[PDB]
Design a protein around this ligand. Structure first.
Ligand code: ZN
Ligand code: ZN
Ligand code: ZN
Ligand code: ZN
Ligand code: ZN
Ligand code: ZN
Lengths: 187, 585, 296, 186
RNA sequence: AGCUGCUCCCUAGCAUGCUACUACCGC
RNA sequence: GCGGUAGUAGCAUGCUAGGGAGCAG
């Protein structure tokens, strides 16, 4: 606050005050240059203090709208990401078997817990111990959900490949034993 | 959180705009910020204006407001100048002593390492300051080498040559083995593993490390590692003990190290001794005789390059028990007869890039001249040993300085070991030049070596010097003289026995064309150490600071034992060298 | 949020009353608003008197009051002029350099594209101002093309001729293939799919893209797409390389492109070259010979 | 805070008023020094207020950043401090069953499995030298973890079973010494 | 990597309020 | 001599906002 119409006027008033104080002519001169510093002070009261508040207001508004601009950019980014995820995951599901299972519904609305049952192209078994392994996935082929599956890529908790000959009865205590058998849909 | 560079006072401030981001104390950091253009400081938090969307990076414009650092117009009414009292706000405020002379470290921080005076500063400033000079020097030029184009192969003409395109915008690096490239195989996923090759012009002749077949579109880059600040200074202070402490002398000695034994008498009594290592006097003989004098000790055979430690490995095959030897290179083809990666053994043969953190008895560091302050300090960072042994000699060869353009760096200031080697003199040397005849050894004694090298056998009368003028043609990064290839044109005629005098050359491409005309083998003057031939021919071809350099060419002269050819086109060495001279055909 | 038109300074202000709503910097936007009739500006929020039931749209009449922009009589006692210092209030205040010559951009912004001098302006102004010239050109005529009547069919005469009525109020586009119509089948729900036709007078001959039979009451419109802004300039800067970089020459050539080879000799050497194409000299021949010279 | 410039002016005004009240001369001449002294504590407690809060501002910010530095330096050394603390507690623990195996591992007897605790179940203890054999295994009994095990399957490092009576000092430099001496608990 | 509820500590802001000092104005 | 207003500083209360941590289901 130095380049306002009031700095000049206050400077002139104080210049007259100091000039006539060095002159020091009359008591009325002191009264006039005191009643001049006591009015030109109002000039530096409002000309340099209310405008000192407008700067605070303007800065507040500017930062607020900066924040809102960032808010409205993040929306575009999340929208793009979500739509891309939708359009890339859709690409895996539309087999012809989905069409065959939906076209035969009386209405077109099929339950959700039967879509993977009769359309999935890969099964994942998790077996806790060899006893359950023998009654579920014994041999290279097994049948679940009234289909025929063939086994490949058996793995364990540490996710290391385990061949089918290793899982005997006596070798069982030497395996990480949430074994995860994955199988393909034979035809 | 640590100590600053000049003052070593405990501090927490790191100059953001600086090359390697070192620690600086409050007053010390302020002295840097006003005495440089480095206007960024980075403490445990960043000193920037944290109000949204500001760009001010200088510290003076910043003021503290609340729990942050604010600019001019973003501050609250309550503020405080970060830059006050000539010391910028920072942790460890009172415990700062400041540095009286800071302009040295300002110059290093603003240095571009372009002229020789930059290196003079790099070696004249104080201990950790000159280590930082080495740090900044290296850091700069690895930031440089990848700023060149990428060598993308276009066509496969035949074996040993290819076609090379380079990316638009950035230039082509020199055509030598100085800039070692490295390749990866571009695939549908990423780039993986070709290996280190160096390219020259055919057509682009490629010198590959291993056998390999390339296709179209594969490109190589000049890779850099992650350069991490050293700990120890260049070398430990000198201390002369009363006696050989910690070591047990031998019982009897063989003759071939007698002149060496009366030498190891003194390197064993103090910790270090720079060795005036004149080329080919039994230098690795000197190294192995240390173990012959002290068998039970651990002797650390290292060098700046693997091809130099291979020289000490050669004489380990014949004189050293291999039961107690070790060859250390990480996962390049080298001498790999010893057991690989055996840390706690007596003889460890390795290169500074791979010496593991260990403790050993005595070290032998081959070629102290090819190395800078950096590796010569990281060796101390590797070993705090009982005795240090400095093989190499500044009058042999320095590392090739890429950024050194104006002025040459004198024998004095290659590295710290080069300091006391000619101010207080070398502690040590061997005078029996097992290689050179009297024609060369007396010439090189009166060259720089303090009139030192005594004759070995005889004046062979087989070394030739002849004066010429020559006209010079240079295109990209080379220099070819047709007429000086036209004087070897006719001298190899009357001799049916100088067919086997290998062609040495300052620039490899000139002799690469000569070998298309003649067919003699090649040789690089910059890395000529390690192999010596009885008969070699050579042309300086240039009067500037490449071949007429006294020590850069002393190596080319000194590797012949009976005969050598030196076609001199200069006045600098004609009146200075003396061989037998012939007329001009 | 981006760079303004003339200055390319980072900005957040967009002229509402302008044709294509481009970015403008504070001083740059103020220069636009005084040197045009474009008296609307639209930052991350709209600059309109937000007090209930106000009409004012010009920025100068607006003043900031509290958390909004206010008109003359709607303001609170504490206010501030949005239009001050010759730069309008907006984001990225200090990072504005302004443009010395803005009247070209004001001309393109006030242009109706009607005489030849407008097109001279379209190709005289600088790079992205002239990209904007093309943008605004195509924008004005695509807004124009729908402002004609709409070709509703009344009766079916026979094959290839029909009878067309047009709505009252707006005129008839010309009788050529210049304005390609497009129709959809009016149904009980909506209009779906006829195709692109062009009509001339018989009776009204209709030239349809495909074979189709029409009935009474179906109508055709001159559709426009959604014209988005461009990124790249009209063409890249010219650069002449030393040699044919990144291409492998051929081994042997056939005769019918020999006079063509000596031309691809140079185009392979640098980026781009304008091809003086007098009609029917072997032009698509000239293009296939590029592949004959460089097959891969 | 007394080293500020305004304090000098305040002191001069206070001395003037002290002289005035000690003389008690006028009514308005001293009133001048209520228009010139009551002001003297207006540019004094305005300048000596903000600096005093600035002091505590700097102190609080310094403490915050010191704590942040300590927090960054602590969570970057956990995998040395954990081991130091563990071994200090272990040597404070003072249990022979622990000290036995700790010393044995300090010279080489590292087990190759979890030490079983049942009266049955198998153990395998690497033994790299002979002096180590002297203390631990005597005849048929294996002393380890302050327990009594039974020696059964001594074997060399090239996977060849080596008999028990063979183990002696003179013939010791005849075997692949990293023995794996399987045993069972008492 | 959940939903609440209570409590402590630090800072910022606005408003309110209180008190003190200075200036202007008539009475 | 009073009042009022404009200022400045100090203080208190409370409300909001932001950050840290703890307890209970
Ligand atoms: Zn710096
Ligand atoms: Zn310092
Ligand atoms: Zn700022
Ligand atoms: Zn506009
Ligand atoms: Zn602009
Ligand atoms: Zn209004």
């Amino acid at each position: 606050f130095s380049s306002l119409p009031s700095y000049a006027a206050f400077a002139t008033a104080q210049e007259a005050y100091e000039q006539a104080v060095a002159n020091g002519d009359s008591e009325v001169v002191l009264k006039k240059l005191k009643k001049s510093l006591n009015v030109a002070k109002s000039e530096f009261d409002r000309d340099a203090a209310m405008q000192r508040k407008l700067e605070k207001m303007a800065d507040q508004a500017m930062t607020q709208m900066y924040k809102q601009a960032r808010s409205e950019d993040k929306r575009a980014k999340v929208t793009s990401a979500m739509q891309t995820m939708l359009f890339t995951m859709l690409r895996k599901l539309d087999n012809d078997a989905l069409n065959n299972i939906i076209n035969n519904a009386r209405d077109g609305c099929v339950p959700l817990n039967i879509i993977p049952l009769t359309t999935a192209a890969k099964l994942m078994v998790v077996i806790p111990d060899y006893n359950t392994y023998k009654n579920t996935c014994d041999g290279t082929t097994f049948t679940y959900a009234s289909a025929l599956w063939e086994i490949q890529q058996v793995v364990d908790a540490d996710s290391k490949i385990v061949q089918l000959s290793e899982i005997s009865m006596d070798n069982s205590p030497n395996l990480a034993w949430p074994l995860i058998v994955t199988a393909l849909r034979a035809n | 959180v640590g100590a600053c560079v000049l003052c070593n006072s405990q501090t927490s401030l790191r100059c953001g705009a600086c090359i390697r981001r070192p620690f600086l104390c409050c007053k010390c950091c302020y002295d840097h910020v006003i005495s440089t253009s480095h206007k960024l400081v980075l403490s445990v938090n960043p000193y920037v204006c944290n109000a949204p969307g500001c760009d001010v990076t200088d510290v003076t414009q910043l003021y503290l407001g609340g729990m942050s650092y604010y600019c001019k117009s973003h501050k609250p009414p309550i503020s405080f100048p970060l830059c006050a009292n000539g010391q910028v706000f920072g942790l460890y405020k009172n415990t700062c002593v400041g540095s009286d002379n800071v302009t040295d470290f300002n110059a290093i921080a603003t240095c571009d390492w372009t002229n020789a005076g930059d290196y003079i500063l790099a070696n004249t400033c104080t201990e950790r300051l000159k280590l930082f000079a080495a740090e900044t020097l290296k850091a700069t030029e690895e930031t440089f080498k990848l700023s060149y184009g990428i060598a993308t192969v276009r066509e496969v003409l035949s074996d040993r040559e290819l076609h090379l395109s380079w990316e638009v915008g950035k230039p082509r690096p020199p055509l030598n083995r100085n800039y070692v490239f490295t390749g990866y195989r571009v695939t549908k996923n990423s780039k993986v593993q070709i290996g280190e090759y160096t390219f020259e012009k055919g057509a682009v002749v490629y010198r590959g490390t291993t056998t390999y077949k390339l296709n179209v579109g594969d490109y190589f880059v000049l890779t850099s590692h992650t350069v991490m600040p050293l700990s120890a200074p260049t070398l430990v202070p000198q201390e002369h003990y009363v006696r050989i402490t910690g070591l047990y002398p031998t019982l009897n000695i063989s003759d071939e190290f007698s002149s060496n034994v009366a030498n190891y008498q003194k390197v064993g009594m103090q910790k270090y001794s720079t060795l005036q290592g004149p080329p080919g006097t039994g230098k690795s003989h000197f190294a192995i005789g240390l173990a012959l004098y002290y068998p039970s000790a651990r002797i650390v055979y290292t060098a700046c390059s693997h091809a130099a430690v291979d020289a000490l490995c050669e004489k380990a095959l014949k004189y050293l028990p291999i039961d107690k030897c070790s060859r250390i290179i990480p996962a390049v083809e080298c001498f790999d007869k010893f057991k690989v990666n055996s840390t706690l053994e007596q003889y460890v043969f390795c290169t500074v890039n791979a010496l593991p953190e260990t403790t050993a008895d005595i070290v032998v560091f081959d070629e102290i001249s090819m190395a800078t302050n950096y590796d010569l300090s990281v060796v101390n960072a590797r070993l705090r040993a009982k005795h240090y042994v400095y093989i190499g000699d500044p009058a042999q060869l320095p590392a090739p300085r890429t950024l050194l353009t104006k002025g040459t760096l004198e024998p004095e200031y290659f590295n710290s070991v080069c300091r006391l080697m000619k101010t207080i003199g070398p502690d040590m040397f061997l005078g029996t030049c097992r290689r050179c005849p009297a024609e060369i050894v007396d010439t090189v004694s009166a060259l720089v070596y303090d009139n030192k090298l005594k004759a070995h056998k005889d004046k062979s009368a087989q070394c030739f010097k002849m004066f010429y003028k020559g006209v010079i043609t240079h295109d990209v990064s080379s220099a070819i003289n047709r007429p000086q290839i036209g004087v070897v044109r006719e001298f190899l005629t009357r001799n049916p026995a100088w067919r086997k005098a290998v062609f040495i050359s300052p620039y490899n491409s000139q002799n690469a064309v000569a070998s298309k005309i003649l067919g003699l083998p090649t040789q690089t003057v910059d890395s000529s150490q390690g192999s010596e031939y009885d008969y070699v021919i050579f042309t300086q071809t240039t009067e500037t600071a490449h071949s007429c350099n006294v020590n850069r060419f002393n190596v080319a002269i000194t590797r012949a034992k009976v005969g050598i050819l030196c076609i001199m086109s200069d006045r600098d060495l004609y009146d200075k060298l003396q061989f037998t001279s012939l007329e001009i055909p």
